């Protein structure tokens, strides 16, 4: 609440009231989504022998390698747990906040 | 099991692979390696990471 | 397929999974040779045009 | 990853690893699947 549009100190600026900024959590994504160019064949990675150098990775744009790894970890493991090395911390809202 | 499971020769568990050919774009980064698996060694690519 | 959705005042997408068999078979016949054959059905990424 | 299986081919589900009443804790005796 700014009481006065004018600059400089005044009596009316004793009524200005301060509010904390909204909390913003900036971090790498879960399981490091977004670092690696998957499914971009213009930026497709290589695994090939040095004699041949013919790429054995044939990636596709209508594949979703990130989501295929997010759904795989749910099936073969406890997804609620936290593994800091692969930054494996699943995005999870609070159930009281979503459904009041 | 005693025999024929684990070697007795000087061999590393974890290897360190310097980039042969790295590149820093303003929008991306590219790193090229030599993933040299020596004789009588097997590498599961699950144990590989950057 | 004819989807009918609730209206939203924002440009939205529609992410349909056409479930296939995205299968790779990997052959390594000699030292340093890495041959792979990729095949998915029905939505194959290679036909006689390529 | 897969429930236990006998092989008589046909492929038959094996009853091993199932939970039972025991007078002694079952983890120190068997593997419970």
């Amino acid at each position: 609440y700014m009481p006065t549009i004018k600059e400089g100190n005044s009596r009316e600026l004793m009524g200005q009231q301060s509010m904390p900024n909204r909390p913003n959590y900036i971090a790498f994504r879960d399981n490091f989504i977004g670092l690696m160019y998957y499914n971009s064949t213009g930026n497709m990675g290589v695994l090939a022998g040095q004699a041949s150098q013919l790429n054995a990775v044939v990636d596709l744009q209508d594949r979703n390698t990130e989501l295929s790894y997010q759904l795989l970890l749910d099936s073969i493991g406890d997804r609620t747990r936290y593994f800091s090395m692969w930054n494996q911390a699943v995005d999870s809202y609070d159930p009281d906040v979503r459904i009041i | 099991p005693t025999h024929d499971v684990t070697t007795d020769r000087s061999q590393r568990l974890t290897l360190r692979f310097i980039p042969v050919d790295r590149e820093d774009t303003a929008y991306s980064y590219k790193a090229r390696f030599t993933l040299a698996v020596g004789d009588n060694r097997v590498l599961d690519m699950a144990s590989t990471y950057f | 397929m004819t989807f009918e959705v609730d209206p939203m005042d924002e440009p939205t997408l529609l992410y349909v999974l056409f479930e296939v068999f995205d299968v790779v078979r990997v052959h390594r016949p000699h030292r340093g040779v890495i041959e792979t054959v990729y095949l998915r059905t029905p939505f194959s990424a290679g036909n006689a045009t390529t | 990853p897969r429930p236990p299986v006998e092989e008589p081919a046909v492929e038959t589900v094996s009853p091993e690893g199932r939970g039972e009443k025991r007078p002694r804790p079952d983890r120190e005796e068997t593997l419970v699947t």
Partner: peptide
């Protein structure tokens, strides 16, 4: 033979199950 590469539970080599050799999981299939 390849049965001397297994730990011996007793005097018998503890061989793994034949059913654990392949994977079959997909997205609901």
């Amino acid at each position: 033979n390849f049965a001397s590469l297994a730990p011996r539970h007793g005097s018998r080599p503890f061989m793994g199950n034949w059913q654990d050799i392949g994977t079959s999981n997909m997205s609901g299939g």
